[PDB]
Amino acid sequence: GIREKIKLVSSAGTGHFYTTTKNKRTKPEKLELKKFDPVVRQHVIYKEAK
Amino acid sequence: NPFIRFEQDKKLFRNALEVEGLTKGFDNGPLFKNLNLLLEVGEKLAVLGTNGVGKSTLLKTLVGDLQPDSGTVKWSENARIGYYAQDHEYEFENDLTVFEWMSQWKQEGDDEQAVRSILGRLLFSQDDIKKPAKVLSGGEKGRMLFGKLMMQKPNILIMDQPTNHLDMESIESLNMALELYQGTLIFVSHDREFVSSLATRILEITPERVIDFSGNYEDYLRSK
Amino acid sequence: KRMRVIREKVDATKQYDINEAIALLKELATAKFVESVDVAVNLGIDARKSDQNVRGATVLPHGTGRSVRVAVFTQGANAEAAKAAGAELVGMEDLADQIKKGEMNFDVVIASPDAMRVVGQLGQVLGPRGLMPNPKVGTVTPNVAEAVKNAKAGQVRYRNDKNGIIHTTIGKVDFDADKLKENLEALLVALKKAKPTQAKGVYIKKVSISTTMGAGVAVD
């Protein structure tokens, strides 16, 4: 529907991303969640991308 | 085509302006010497002149912001002055939103409705009013100041330079809005068609004599 | 006379040889002067780009033929070491505001990183002419004693114009022809060594040794 797909690309430098959905009409700003990066095995920040 | 119309609140009857002698000059030869003036409740008084002769400094001291070496400007008994400055950027600050910024300007209307309609009448969609009022651009900055005088209902108007960023359709709406306006306004515009069609009583500024009045501005140039 | 007779005698349509060029260069002898003859090499770069610029200094085996009044604007121990190198200045701003204000100029500028005084003292007068030694060119270096000897040794400086062509002093007529050839080879090799990395196309196209008061002849 109105909810489209984004990917949260990690900030640890490695290429890893959690893919989710986000409604843009209500909120046009980015998403920032501290998630787990299996490449470096640590909890790092995941800024929205794509 | 935004739909704007200005309506009065008390409608003074005899006259508005009273200027005896202005003699205001910043750091050079004074831009005007005396400028005896009277408005007489109407007389849309298009101030004119080439840029750099001080038509905006005349209006700024005509409203009482810049103190002149004059002897006061003597507004009427119940004048409600509405100002649309040539530069308008101090108003759009402190990161109020579109709905927030518009809301404080009112006297009797309600806060939720009757200000959404006025703000939304001039082409502001539902999702356009939930963003900061400083991020607006150009005509929307101008369109706010037209809406600002909607609810204020200024009995006497100024409109320093109204047709600046408007998109050739708001100009047709603004030209129509001031045409049926009842009351007094003292504007200075630079284009010809806006001044020509809109009612006028010319006061051109050239060094040193300030020529006053020739009628329609279709006759002011015809006299040349 | 000479400027209208050197034109027909020496033709620019044909490209000459190195050995002949030095011989014809001294062949003129029309103008009695020091005649510091020189060469302008058409470097192939895009001077519009800031990464293709060539700006450095090199030393010739025989020298420039003249000692530059290398004032040392390096306050501290550099002045003590540079006092025995033959410098006409000490490390301070004294030779830049009163000495360098009404004074005309020095020959070269020796810089000391420990003193940020002569950097602004020259300003639009001592720097507007380009006399300020670039930090990467060795004019302003961590030390002052080593550079002073090399500066007097004939550390020639070369920069591109707006087009990207380089010409700097190589020697005088008083130097014998064999000396000049080695001096020319010293410039070309260091110029070729310092040629940048984003330099598409052929680098050296035209090389033309010229007289101070005469003409210039193509070499290759």
């Binding site: 009409r25 | 963003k131 408007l166 050739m168 | 940020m116 720097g127 380009g130 030694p133």
Partner: protein, 228 residues
């Protein structure tokens, strides 16, 4: 000899111009027009490369010069008139500010040693030693008198303020994204003046003004951005 490329932008709900795909080049001046509050100013703001779009179609030409007059004609009441014109050269301005922290620095560091030399050699390479004089002749050439060269921009009439801001844009650049709505300078005399300057200059320029007559005399192509 180069051209520009495509972009796509959105500041929230209902994205604005949705996969634009255009090219600007040659000598023709694309007059860009559009209704209020729809692309235009922010479309070519993206083109300047200072801010990047959301969908990111990208439009690159990083070799030649871009000079941009903007809509905020009062964005500098502080800088003196000579400083605003010099600041039109972005590389020169940013270099000078970090260079100018010499007399404001009472103590110098070791790493500052060659840093001040590194900035100064860049200053001379792009010949900032004439920027004040180079602008002055140009600034005098657009009609600004000498006596106000060193004065602040706060004390300059807005009609005059466009003549300074156009001189800032004209800094030897073979394209200009002109946000010039000749708002204050509508003397007809000054309007007729600005029509000669742009017409007799060969550049792949863009003009955005709402003046129907002004777009006739100058622009050759139009790039209306109306529906989507």
């Amino acid at each position: 000899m180069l051209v520009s490329s495509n972009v796509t932008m959105q500041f929230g709900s209902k994205p604005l111009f949705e996969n634009i795909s255009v090219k600007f080049g040659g000598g023709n001046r694309y007059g860009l027009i559009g209704a209020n509050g729809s692309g235009k100013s922010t479309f070519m703001k993206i083109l300047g490369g200072d801010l990047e779009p959301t969908l990111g179609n990208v439009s690159l030409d990083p070799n030649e010069r871009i000079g941009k007059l903007r809509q905020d004609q009062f964005a500098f009441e502080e800088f003196t008139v000579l400083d605003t014109v010099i600041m039109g050269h972005k590389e020169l301005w940013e270099v000078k500010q970090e260079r100018d922290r010499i007399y404001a620095l009472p103590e110098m560091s070791e790493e500052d040693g060659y840093k001040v030399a590194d900035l100064e050699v860049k200053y001379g390479e792009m010949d900032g030693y004439s920027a004040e004089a180079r602008a002055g002749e140009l600034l005098l050439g657009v009609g600004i008198p000498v006596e106000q060269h060193y004065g602040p921009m706060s004390e300059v009439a807005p009609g005059w303020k466009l003549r300074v801001l156009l001189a800032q844009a004209l800094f030897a650049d073979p394209d200009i994204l002109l946000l010039d709505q000749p708002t204050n300078n509508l003397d007809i005399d000054t309007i007729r003046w600005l029509e000669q300057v742009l017409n007799e200059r060969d550049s792949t320029m863009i003009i955005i003004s709402h003046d129907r007559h002004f777009l006739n005399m100058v622009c050759t192509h139009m790039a209306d951005l109306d529906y989507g």
